[PDB]
Design a protein around this ligand. Sequence first.
Ligand SMILES: *[C@@H]1O[C@H](CO)[C@@H](O[C@@H]2O[C@H](CO)[C@@H](O[C@@H]3O[C@H](CO[C@H]4O[C@H](CO[C@H]5O[C@H](CO)[C@@H](O)[C@H](O)[C@@H]5O)[C@@H](O)[C@H](O)[C@@H]4O)[C@@H](O)[C@H](O[C@@H]4O[C@H](CO)[C@@H](O)[C@H](O)[C@@H]4O[C@H]4O[C@H](CO)[C@@H](O)[C@H](O)[C@@H]4O)[C@@H]3O)[C@H](O)[C@H]2NC(C)=O)[C@H](O)[C@H]1NC(C)=O
Ligand SMILES: *[C@@H]1O[C@H](CO)[C@@H](O[C@@H]2O[C@H](CO)[C@@H](O[C@@H]3O[C@H](CO[C@H]4O[C@H](CO)[C@@H](O)[C@H](O)[C@@H]4O)[C@@H](O)[C@H](O)[C@@H]3O)[C@H](O)[C@H]2NC(C)=O)[C@H](O)[C@H]1NC(C)=O
Ligand SMILES: *[C@@H]1O[C@H](CO)[C@@H](O[C@@H]2O[C@H](CO)[C@@H](O)[C@H](O)[C@H]2NC(C)=O)[C@H](O)[C@H]1NC(C)=O
Ligand code: CA
Ligand code: CA
Ligand code: CA
Ligand code: CU
Ligand code: CU
Lengths: 611, 619
Amino acid sequence: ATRRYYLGAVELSWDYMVVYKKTLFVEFTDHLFRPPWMGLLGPTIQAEVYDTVVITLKNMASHPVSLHAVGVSYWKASEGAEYDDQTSQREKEDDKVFPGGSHTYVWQVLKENGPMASDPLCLTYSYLSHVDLVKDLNSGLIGALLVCREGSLAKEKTQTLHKFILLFAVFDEGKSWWPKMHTVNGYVNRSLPGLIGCHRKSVYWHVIGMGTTPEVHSIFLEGHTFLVRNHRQASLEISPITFLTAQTLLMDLGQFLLFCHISSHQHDGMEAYVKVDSCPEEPQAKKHPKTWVHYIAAEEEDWDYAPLVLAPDDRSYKSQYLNNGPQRIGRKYKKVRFMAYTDETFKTREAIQHESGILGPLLYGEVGDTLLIIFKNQASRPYNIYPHGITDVRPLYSRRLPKGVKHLKDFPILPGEIFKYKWTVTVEDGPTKSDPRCLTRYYSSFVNMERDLASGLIGPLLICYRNVILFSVFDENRSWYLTENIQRFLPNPAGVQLEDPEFQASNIMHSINGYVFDSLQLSVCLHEVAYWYILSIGAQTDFLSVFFSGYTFKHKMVYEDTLTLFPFSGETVFMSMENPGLWILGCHNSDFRNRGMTALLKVSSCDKNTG
Amino acid sequence: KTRHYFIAAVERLWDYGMSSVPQFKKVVFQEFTDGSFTQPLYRGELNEHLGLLGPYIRAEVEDNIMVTFRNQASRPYSFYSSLISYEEDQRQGAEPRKNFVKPNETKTYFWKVQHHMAPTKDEFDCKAWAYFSDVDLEKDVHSGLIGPLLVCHTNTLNPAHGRQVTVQEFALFFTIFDETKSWYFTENMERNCMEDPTFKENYRFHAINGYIMDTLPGLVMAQDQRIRWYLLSMGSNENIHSIHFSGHVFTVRKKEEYKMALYNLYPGVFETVEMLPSKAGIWRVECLIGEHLHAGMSTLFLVYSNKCQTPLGMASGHIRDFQITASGQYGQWAPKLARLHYSGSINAWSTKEPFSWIKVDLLAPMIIHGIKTQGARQKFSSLYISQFIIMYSLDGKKWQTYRGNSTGTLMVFFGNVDSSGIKHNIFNPPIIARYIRLHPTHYSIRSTLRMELMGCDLNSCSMPLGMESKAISDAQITASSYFTNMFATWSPSKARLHLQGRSNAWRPQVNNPKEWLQVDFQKTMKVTGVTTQGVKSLLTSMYVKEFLISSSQDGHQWTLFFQNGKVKVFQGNQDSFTPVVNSLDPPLLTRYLRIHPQSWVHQIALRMEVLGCEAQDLY
Ligand SMILES: *[C@@H]1O[C@H](CO)[C@@H](O[C@@H]2O[C@H](CO)[C@@H](O[C@@H]3O[C@H](CO[C@H]4O[C@H](CO[C@H]5O[C@H](CO)[C@@H](O)[C@H](O)[C@@H]5O)[C@@H](O)[C@H](O)[C@@H]4O)[C@@H](O)[C@H](O[C@@H]4O[C@H](CO)[C@@H](O)[C@H](O)[C@@H]4O[C@H]4O[C@H](CO)[C@@H](O)[C@H](O)[C@@H]4O)[C@@H]3O)[C@H](O)[C@H]2NC(C)=O)[C@H](O)[C@H]1NC(C)=O
Ligand SMILES: *[C@@H]1O[C@H](CO)[C@@H](O[C@@H]2O[C@H](CO)[C@@H](O[C@@H]3O[C@H](CO[C@H]4O[C@H](CO)[C@@H](O)[C@H](O)[C@@H]4O)[C@@H](O)[C@H](O)[C@@H]3O)[C@H](O)[C@H]2NC(C)=O)[C@H](O)[C@H]1NC(C)=O
Ligand SMILES: *[C@@H]1O[C@H](CO)[C@@H](O[C@@H]2O[C@H](CO)[C@@H](O)[C@H](O)[C@H]2NC(C)=O)[C@H](O)[C@H]1NC(C)=O
Ligand SMILES: [Ca+2]
Ligand SMILES: [Ca+2]
Ligand SMILES: [Ca+2]
Ligand SMILES: [Cu+2]
Ligand SMILES: [Cu+2]
């Protein structure tokens, strides 16, 4: 036999080392009576191209569980599907197996089934059961299947074992059989072992998304940048059901954490720890960087998302947002932004452009360049200044930490003070050969991670080998200056609806770069090529962002994508855009009420000014 | 250079079923000569697959899309895409100045299909942008329309004739259909008998090109022929639809060549992929989101083999006489007469001058690559059919005028121009119906025909293996016992259909109710059926009338066929001369096969072929 496997279907219980019972995939030598990190997964089966496998699943279950293949070739024998395929019996036989029934599957690694060679060695697919998908998969009906370039496994003895299978799974335990789950390979709260890798050696992630509902995730690794498409991802955006082969460089040592970052997801699970140790050893001018300087500060001011036509009362869609009424505080709220401030210590650099609203100073990083954020918290509550994207961030003058605390972002939060920061850029942090240059980044105030941001503190960091559009949602309600806002604009002095649906979301504006329904207009002259660094923040759910003008517009991430871009939220990527378009531009929040509630903006087609 | 399309928004009714019937009034896109209404709004055959989708507006790099547009519904709409581009302007404005079209109003959009609207050196001979109606980005779109635009590089899509053709194109578009947020009372109020929980899920279709559950139609595939797929996806945030091509994988380009077996449509994204279905048959393509599947969003592409072709036996036995039907024929030249059947006076069907229809019940739905037409002489005067169209259906409810390739309203076929014409007309792309009708258009002083349509079965099976074609070894064939005498040697090896020679048949040494003839296929095989025969040798005629079939995957163990419980008696061949054929309804599949005569006339004797298709070796 080229290669063969024996699967079971055994019903075992599960504690996510809460107790739950599940009917999952099992393997043996040939009937009878693993490695922990794998945990839940039905065993990862893998074949070189040309060589072809056979399972013989035994349904040692209550459930009649079938075996679908998602990425090889069959004959209506291999697939586990019953559908009106007019093939009849013996050929639907394994196209869904019976309880107690031990029936046999065949499949092939066709020369065409194989990776492209622009592709990574071993393309991650998986398997499952095509017999009530929701009633199935939940309870453990998912394994990992991988096909690889021909002279393939032979290398594995030579090759890296750094082949870890990451199963990101939202098991709605309460199907096939009370509330949900969010596991990573079948663990919840930072549970689970394995996940060790070598120090200067890199690790590869065989990633599997798992849904059974429109459920979405965005999963990072504590201070670590992902490589997937050969474009640095930094995010591992992960759709309802995806297959992804990613890699991680693994510089430095110790315990860092991968984890789903969203809203309620962490309160459900989806975070787990990845150790790196040191490993056993076995040998058988015209150029260069300069460093950036930024005298910057967090000062406070009121923000007005205005002004255009005010359409009162009956405009119970429009006005409700930005009209001062008996229980509403439109347009203007008190915020805190970053300013590069003009008149103060370590002089300055300050002039504002209307075109980026709240958005902070733009901070530019060329690989190997350093940054010098001489930051001061100019106003009120103590706030922090940390850049998502770079890595070597320690106060200049010392690798020491304020004695008191861990990772500066965590704490020393400077309430009336001034702190001097250094953002050294490595090539690691920077764009690859493949990704377009100047990948988009942002920086916030990690006084926690979210709470302040909403208040109004945010700006754009470019990393490179400058029109910026940040979509964002400003909650206002979680904003620090709510007390100061309620008691400045609302008609009754203090006493009023403590909280309510009516006003809650009536004080969550949909930004457009912290600008509202129509703003900006923007100043681009025809035929000027731009680079459009755009990003979502604020509240989450995917994004759908597009340009809709006198040329609608099309842009290129590599191959040109159209009336579409999709920032994952709390996330960002950037865009080249030839401008031979034309004037007046719907600029897309694009999605749902998101569209009705806050999107618009515009574009131009001026010409004839030169320098 | 340049291309124009004549396109318009219609309001029409949408249904599914095949399981109270839900009838919905959504608004879609159609294309016609420019005659506004009564004529001409026609498209069909291969393009079924779009369904709700507006038609393929295909252009090249460089050239122009001109797109005339006519709204015919209550609330004004607009043809817009990403590329509705150059609008140079002159103190007149641009974007809101041609924004929308009122009902009955009529506008033409026309732009230069720039490079920035194109496929790159990074491959795929075509891209796949999308057209919507703006005005309401969500409302109208949900209710009514969506269109697939595709631009390709230079000498790419065929002159005058259609578009592309090197390769087959398909735009499967995936979405959730909420309704209610789309169209109002005329939609909402109909079937009245109440806002979100109660039946809200019921209005929501999860539908490929607007066909919930397995309803989607047009998936003529064709084994081993590059197929480009267009996956443009749309709707709200729920639809991240993770489409999967059942046990097929495809490639995509985007600065490189990536292989993958499912790709996710972020609403708005579209995309293009190429794959070649190595194995033919029916297969699924679905979003693999569990919830989203059992709510619909699954369809079957129904790929055929090219090397499948065979007569369905209008000449031979398999076709029985009851199968046919006619307008009613003047003269006794009744149908039941078609192809090569020259007997005495009567050899064909033949009506008088008024327009007619010879329809054929295939008794099952089936694929058909082409028909062979006939005419006959009587009284010197030459009788034939000169020109005709084919109609086809599955249930006898639906009917369809077949177009295939032919530019315009349909393809008319060219019949014979004489008695004994033999015109193999060809149906690529091919028909799928159980029911083929035939309407004549031209004739010579009368209408009249013999015919024998040729196709292959819905699966790509039903084909002869070795035996007659001699491809199976007379080393491979064995039998229980045989009649060997000096000279004459009725060897098992001679059991091959339509073979003429010394000792041209099989014969068991002397007769037994239970004997056997066997065939060492070698490979493990599927068997559609068996064509059976009989031989006359020197004025004595002999044939096998009743028979029983064994099969084994086991050299020494055998399992008799059993039908409807009981083991079954096979009826065929009342004569030596002719061969007749047995269906084998649930097809036994084995490496080795055996056959036992029961009622054998005069003497036992057999020639035969087997029918079938290859299944995996070593299992
Ligand atoms: C109605 O519409 C349909 C489609 O919507 C059209 O029918 C299609 O017709 C086209 C063109 O007539 C058909 O394509 C023909 O195919 C044959 C043989 O098939 C080829 O592919 C087979 C599989 O191999 C694949 O992989 C190969 C690489 O390993 C690759 O080359 C190949 O393309 C395949 O992808 C295999 O049998 C062979 O490999 C074979 O090539 C082909 O011979 C036809 O002719 C070629 O034409 C090009 C361009 O001129 C030449 O460069 C080639 O050398 C071939 O030359 C042929 O024509 C010349 C004369 O010009 C002749 O001298 C020579 O002998 C060859 O015959 C052609 O490409 C397609 O399969 C049909 N599809 C369908 C669905 O019906 C029609 O427009 C129309 N048809 C009707 C009947 O009404
Ligand atoms: C994994 O870690 C999770 C957190 O990191 C754990 O979740 C929490 O722990 C349990 C299980 O959910 C809860 O225990 C009680 O829950 C109530 C109510 O929970 C919240 O939601 C209700 C909804 O109305 C709301 O009314 C409450 O105010 C809560 O916001 C709590 O009030 C009790 O204090 C009590 O803890 C926790 O609630 C829940 N977290 C929160 C924020 O409540 C989870 O148990 C871990 N699971 C495993 C398997 O390890
Ligand atoms: C455009 O659409 C309406 C249909 O609502 C048109 O009404 C029809 O006009 C054509 C003229 O060719 C006639 O065939 C029909 O008799 C009309 N239908 C009716 C009256 O129900 C009308 O021409 C246009 N509408 C408006 C408002 O001008
Ligand atoms: Ca099977
Ligand atoms: Ca099947
Ligand atoms: Ca914060
Ligand atoms: Cu999550
Ligand atoms: Cu889906």
